[PDB]
């Protein structure tokens, strides 16, 4: 889920 993850 995003945003939150390292890719967000």
Swiss-Prot record:
Changing residue 3 to V: Abolishes the very slow conformation equilibrium. Disulfide bonds join 2-8. The modification D-tryptophan is found at residue 4. It comes from the Eukaryota. The modification Cysteine amide is found at residue 8. This is Contryphan-Lo. The chain holds residues 55 to 62 of 63 of the full protein.
């Amino acid at each position: 889920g995003c945003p939150x993850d390292p890719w967000c």
